[PDB]
């Protein structure tokens, strides 16, 4: 009622006051002395040309060589990036897939989409074929992002405005995170695999502690739908790319907006964002059919990745940081170095 | 220069590519239809003859039609509506008896405006089904059409009101050139409805073929 509305009013007022008090000067003033990275060499080393339809998600294995890609033709394709060979081809029960994951151990993969079911496939079997290890259900909306914590614990983001930490051995939601008011369209796991950020459709991102489950911090400032989130390699920050043609950097300590990567030239939103191994370069896939890589410190366009006919949908960087890979809406993935 | 194991891996990759190509050829001959309604407009009634998304497969005249009923997807439509960009047609169903509902036809018109005038469906045809024609007759025999339609000059006659509703739903389209709207006063009747869809689908396909020939 009215008094609860008023305490919420004063609580967010004092939160904003503390945020502004903890702000003295933008880090653009602290970073202008650093020599800019300049124009970045970018070439198409390999071109994975196996898909036959729209490509919606991808992920890099921890070996930095095998990558799994998901397309609307209902096929999960696991490629050896070094030789562009197709290690595996998995038929999906539901052809509508928008998320994909690769287990840290490499034994399992995850997939999901409009079926509201997260399917976990076992990659290493004595039968010599991939099989659907376990289907997880309980999400009332479409699955947008799923990430592996280990061989047995997964965390999934759905369109039901809630996230869920599951248990593949048993198949029930071990924990449920319900703090959002819109579709949660992305997910990122911190390096320690204890905290994770989720950017939803209410133009806000939220930080959750997977150990027990509750929204530790809420970050706002976006003017439209948030389509991608990605942790900083240090783990004390993250970057969110949204539909308003802006990428934004937040930290888990100051809990404030840091940088607004945007330009008057581009107006299309962001589909995927990922950092580099050192975190100096921040890549962002756009609807303008090209991926812009920005200096994470200078807020300047370090380079342009223009080799895709259609809109870039998924983007990933290998664990060793040796190369990046973009899967656009055309049937081709591309590897850049 | 590749070793024996690398050669065998390349052979396996080639076999996987062949299987992918065969599956793509098999799927490319399947016609996809995106079904949309209003929950009670009669999607079940249209699908009766042949927790997330629902898929229905049916064969007619050696043609495999796949219909994707989104149904209970209670999320943001614009977030996943681009997944269906490329379907052959959009089967939009609506009940004519809903003019004494909720106002419900106003919501149906709003949904039709949103779907038809969407950047993704700039070239996909819309097949409009108007069901509950008998219920429409029963309601119009007692309830005047002007209840939901203040700007209507006509009598309580089925043909006139039905034609007015069809014309007004049709003119909600903005790209009258590159996209066509097909309408059919569906009923229980027989497989005629399916026949209609087939004809419309063939139409779309013909145009698509002429687009591949660049001569359209």
């Amino acid at each position, epitope marked *: 009622l009215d008094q609860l509305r008023q305490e919420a009013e004063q609580l967010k007022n004092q939160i904003r006051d503390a945020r502004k008090a903890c702000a003295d000067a933008t880090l653009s003033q602290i970073t202008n002395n650093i020599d800019p990275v300049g124009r970045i060499q970018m070439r198409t080393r390999r071109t994975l040309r196996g898909h036959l339809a729209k490509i919606y998600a991808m992920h890099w294995g921890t070996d930095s060589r095998l990558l799994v890609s998901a397309s609307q033709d209902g096929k999960l394709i696991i490629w050896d990036s070094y030789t562009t*060979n197709k290690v595996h081809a998995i038929p999906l029960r539901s052809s509508w897939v928008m998320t994909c994951a690769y287990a840290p151990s490499g034994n399992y993969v995850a997939c999901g989409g409009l079926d509201n079911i997260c399917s976990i496939y076992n990659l290493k079997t*004595r039968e010599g074929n991939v099989r659907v290890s376990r289907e997880l259900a309980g999400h009332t909306g479409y699955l947008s992002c799923c990430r592996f914590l280990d061989d047995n614990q997964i965390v999934t983001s759905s369109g039901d405005t809630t996230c869920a930490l599951w248990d593949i051995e048993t198949g029930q939601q071990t924990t449920t995170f319900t703090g959002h008011t819109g579709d949660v369209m992305s997910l990122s796991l911190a390096p320690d695999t204890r905290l994770f950020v989720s950017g939803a459709c209410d133009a806000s991102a939220k930080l959750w502690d997977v150990r027990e489950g509750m929204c530790r911090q809420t970050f706002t400032g976006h003017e439209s739908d948030i389509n991608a989130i990605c942790f900083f390699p240090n783990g004390n920050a993250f970057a969110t790319g949204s539909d308003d043609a802006t990428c934004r950097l937040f930290d888990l300590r100051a809990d404030q907006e840091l940088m607004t990567y945007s330009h008057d030239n581009i107006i299309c939103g962001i589909t995927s964002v990922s950092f580099s191994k050192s975190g100096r370069l921040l890549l962002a896939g756009y609807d303008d059919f090209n991926c812009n890589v920005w200096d994470a410190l200078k807020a300047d366009r370090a380079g342009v990745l223009a080799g895709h006919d259609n809109r870039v949908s998924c983007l990933g960087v290998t664990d060793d940081g040796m190369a990046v890979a973009t899967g656009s809406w055309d049937s081709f993935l591309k590897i850049w170095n | *220069t590749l070793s024996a194991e690398d050669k*065998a*891996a390349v*052979e396996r990759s080639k076999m996987i590519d062949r299987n992918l190509r065969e599956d793509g050829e098999k799927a490319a001959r399947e016609v996809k239809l995106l079904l949309l309604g209003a929950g009670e407009s009669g999607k079940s009634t249209i699908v009766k003859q042949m927790t997330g998304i629902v898929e229905t497969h049916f064969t007619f005249k050696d043609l495999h039609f796949k219909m994707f009923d989104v149904g209970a997807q209670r999320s943001e439509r614009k977030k996943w509506i681009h997944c269906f960009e490329g379907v052959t047609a959009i089967i939009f169903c609506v009940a004519l008896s809903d003019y004494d509902l909720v106002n419900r036809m106003h919501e149906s018109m709003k949904l039709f405006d949103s779907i038809c005038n969407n950047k993704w469906f700039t070239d996909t045809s819309i097949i409009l089904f108007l069901n509950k024609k008998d219920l429409f007759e029963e309601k119009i025999k007692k309830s005047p059409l002007t209840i939901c339609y203040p700007e209507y000059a006509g009598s309580n006659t089925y043909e006139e009101a039905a034609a007015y509703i069809q014309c007004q739903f049709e003119d909600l389209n903005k790209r009258k050139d590159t996209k066509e709207i097909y309408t059919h006063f569906t009923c229980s009747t027989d497989t005629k409805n399916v026949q209609f869809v087939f004809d419309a689908v063939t139409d779309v396909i013909i145009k698509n073929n002429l687009k591949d020939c660049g001569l359209f």
Partner: single-chain antibody
Amino acid sequence: DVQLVESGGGLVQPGGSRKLSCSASGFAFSSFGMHWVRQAPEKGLEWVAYISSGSGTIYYADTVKGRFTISRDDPKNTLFLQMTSLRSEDTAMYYCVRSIYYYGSSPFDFWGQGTTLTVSSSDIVMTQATSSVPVTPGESVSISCRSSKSLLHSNGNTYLYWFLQRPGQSPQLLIYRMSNLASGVPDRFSGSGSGTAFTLTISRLEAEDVGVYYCMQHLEYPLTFGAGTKLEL
């Protein structure tokens, strides 16, 4: 589970036209390359033939090239070996080894039960040096194996495997690519080395390690096995 049943044995008068069959039950046999490997009684293993998945690539040993035929029947999960013009040295145990080739795979992981065939009356040379070393439980011995050509490839992986033949049953895979330890095998077996010199230690060796240990090359066809190392006591 995975099961390979081999049949078509017995005694054949020399120069016959017999046949060997191998039924598979428990895995996707259509996507597995299959190897036929013989073993003369008091000798070491020797690769006879191999046929890839999809029957697109077929290889034979030089000793039996033009005399043996290999084929697959995927719908009924069977592997056929046409025998032609048999001679005395063809008398051997026979195995229907399976192998799947992709990045990180473990070829030669499972072995068939074996079938007897008794007939009346540029290759890499792989040497295992010593053939019989006496051991006691609780020890640790470095079995060594030597090749002529350097098995290390430009890719960076040394295509070499070692297997164990325990008394009274089929051989089993111990280590693939000289480093990666195969599934089911305990961590006690560990192998390493370099080009043309490969070693392994059985950390805390005990019983059920008795048998003949074979080192095998896989750089290119034909594949040559070692003489085998006999472990006793």
